[PDB]
Symmetry: C2
Amino acid sequence: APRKFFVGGNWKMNGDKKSLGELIHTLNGAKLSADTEVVCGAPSIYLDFARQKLDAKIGVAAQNCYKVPKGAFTGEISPAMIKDIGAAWVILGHSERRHVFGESDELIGQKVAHALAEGLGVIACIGEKLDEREAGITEKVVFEQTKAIADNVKDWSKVVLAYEPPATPQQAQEVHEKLRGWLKSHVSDAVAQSTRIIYGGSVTGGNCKELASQHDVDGFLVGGASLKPEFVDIINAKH
Amino acid sequence: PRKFFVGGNWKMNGDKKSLGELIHTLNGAKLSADTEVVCGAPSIYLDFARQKLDAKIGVAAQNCYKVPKGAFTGEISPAMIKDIGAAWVILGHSERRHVFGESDELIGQKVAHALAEGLGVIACIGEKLDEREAGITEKVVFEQTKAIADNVKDWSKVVLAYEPPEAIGTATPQQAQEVHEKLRGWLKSHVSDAVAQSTRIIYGGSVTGGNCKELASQHDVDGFLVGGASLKPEFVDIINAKH
């Protein structure tokens, strides 16, 4: 009945076999809470390596994918390829994809639909721009982004929503509560109660316990700290 | 002499089983010793491809970013490509320019970074169909080449790939030769005589087992960047287009 705590580590564009090997060694040897679902998001070039080296209890995510299984899309990878390597998740709609690479809500929706149809789990990311937060339209913006994802989700069992603010723990709770309210009204009470909504702002060993104590925060999508030993402490934030 | 160069761009195709089969075929084929062969694999399979391909065959990434590390979810860097043992990256492919909106400026920044990091670059240029129809092919490809050239210090590790636009139902070896000769003339005056003489300019249009010999006989065509046929048995014949 309770939502299982979920901690994803987004390595972003970082690592080589040496540094990631050391990272993976530390995670494999660490005492990790049985009550946390852990997923590591590796650069595409290291997905195979990461899946081979990581203990099976730790999931592997791709950091992006495209919206069809194959084709004339030089530089892209598909859910079929991600599954072929043994990864079970993909991060979609990350703030950096939206803002540096201009990925639209429409495209992200198409990717979500395809990844889910192909049997992957999706960490679906949403978050408003700084100017939008300053203008007081956080809710309007994140609801639009969430609707664009939701319209492409037939089954929420393998979806985790990640909120990335452009930020206080109280401010985090406020957005998470509003997002869960959106799910309740626009999808169902069952989906609202069961869907993990994870926090994708700045998460460190210093602030993770306070964030994890918030009623509507179900875990984290961790950035820089996911490359460091303190990722273990973040996984164990509730203990 | 300009060594004949054949790159096989697999694009977004394959899995370990199917790419393993295609690699096994290449490893066992009678490939001309006078062709420099490079296979362009999806990023997720670059490590695999380098492990399985004979050392004589190069491996290319299909794209990369412009710094070694950072907050660029979904991107890979030249440092990572080198880490995997690959020695090439394809940059500025028509699909990156068109589908993904990569600018001349960004492509130039990527070229400069990949070269600084010690990779070879297959630098792609080519006009859109509407531009070819307007008769401004030359203007467009020179603009794109300038953006690349401004970011190349040593041309020894660059191969230039010309991609004519796909007809989509609405080209000739002579037409390929015409563009390649113009590009070489551009290099002569904008870079140097030596760079024009030594730089491979490869053809990235529709290359098949059936048209490859005629294309390879053109005076200013130095090889191919092969799309669909790189997934077919005839890729071996294309590698052997001079013979």
